[PDB]
Design a protein around this ligand. Structure first.
Ligand SMILES: NC(=O)C1=CN([C@@H]2O[C@H](COP(=O)(O)OP(=O)(O)OC[C@H]3O[C@@H](n4cnc5c(N)ncnc54)[C@H](OP(=O)(O)O)[C@@H]3O)[C@@H](O)[C@H]2O)C=CC1
Ligand SMILES: COc1cc(-c2c(C)cccc2C)cc([C@@H](C)C#Cc2c(C)nc(N)nc2N)c1
Length: 225
């Protein structure tokens, strides 16, 4: 009953997302987007959750974690529970799946989570294709004289485009209502793929804010008592 939204910055056409434990670029504009979307709420009395695997958590600079003004969840199999406060702004979980069910209980959450953002990394994302309702994917492309950075971690585009369709026509309406975006929506061919979303350029790169949504599903079974 609260939306689960995967959120990621990926380099086309392989959807590379990391190299040696870090992000393969540093794009202040893309960071600001991620910051604002995961922070901001339509309802001022709620926060969002950001869920991340242990290795992602360890890569965030120390002064910047836990990410402010959001409920942070870190998942490690060597942690104790489903969902345990360990510090102000910090929960530990030994289970991606059980922590989401725990987060969804209106009794625990008092209907004061707006959305649950899954913020990485590779392993966490692999596991989120059948959990997320939507994906917010920043599609990044090096400009013509930009060197393609090396990378070692990938979003599963196959499984992506299996389960979700490109709903970037609704991206603007989907974002919290006070975010402001520099570009208008824009369909552009790039190395044999349709790239649709909201353009920016920074450093050696062009990127598009896009939204993917779950495809429609046939009615095979509903559970009856
Ligand atoms: N471009 C982007 O938007 C983003 C990219 N990244 C990139 O991703 C890379 C990191 O990804 P990756 O190395 O795969 O690591 P993750 O951040 O996905 O962490 C993986 C760790 O998470 C824990 N974990 C995984 N599944 C579960 C589960 N079901 N339940 C409980 N714990 C679980 C385990 O911790 P343990 O070993 O402790 O048991 C595991 O080793 C880096 O390069 C980083 O820069 C990260 C965020 C965003
Ligand atoms: C790997 O090490 C990281 C460092 C930071 C980080 C840095 C480098 C500087 C200041 C503050 C922070 C939090 C953040 C992240 C993660 C949580 C991410 C992400 C993300 C981004 C950036 N964009 C889109 N679209 N989706 C995302 N999940 C990882």
């Amino acid at each position: 009953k609260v939306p689960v939204v995967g959120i990621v910055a990926a380099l086309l056409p392989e959807m590379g997302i990391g190299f040696q434990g870090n992000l393969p670029w540093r794009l202040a504009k893309e960071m600001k987007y991620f910051r604002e979307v995961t922070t901001l709420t339509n309802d001022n009395s709620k926060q969002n959750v950001v869920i991340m695997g242990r290795k992602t958590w360890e890569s965030i600079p120390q002064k910047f974690r836990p990410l402010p003004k959001r409920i942070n969840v870190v998942v490690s199999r060597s942690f104790d529970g489903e969902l345990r406060k360990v510090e102000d702004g910090i929960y530990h979980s030994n289970s991606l799946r059980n922590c989401l069910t725990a987060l969804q209980s209106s009794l625990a959450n008092e209907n004061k989570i707006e959305r649950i953002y899954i913020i990485g990394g590779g392993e966490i994302y692999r596991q989120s294709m059948d959990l997320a309702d939507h994906w917010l994917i920043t599609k990044i492309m090096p400009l013509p004289e930009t060197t393609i950075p090396q990378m070692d971690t990938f979003l599963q585009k196959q499984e992506l485009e299996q389960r979700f369709y490109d709903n970037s026509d609704k991206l603007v309406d989907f974002l919290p209502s006070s975010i402001q975006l520099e570009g208008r929506l824009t369909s552009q061919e790039w190395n044999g793929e349709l790239v649709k979303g909201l353009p920016v350029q920074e450093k050696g790169y062009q990127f598009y804010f896009t939204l993917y949504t779950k495809k429609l599903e046939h009615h095979h079974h509903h559970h009856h008592h």
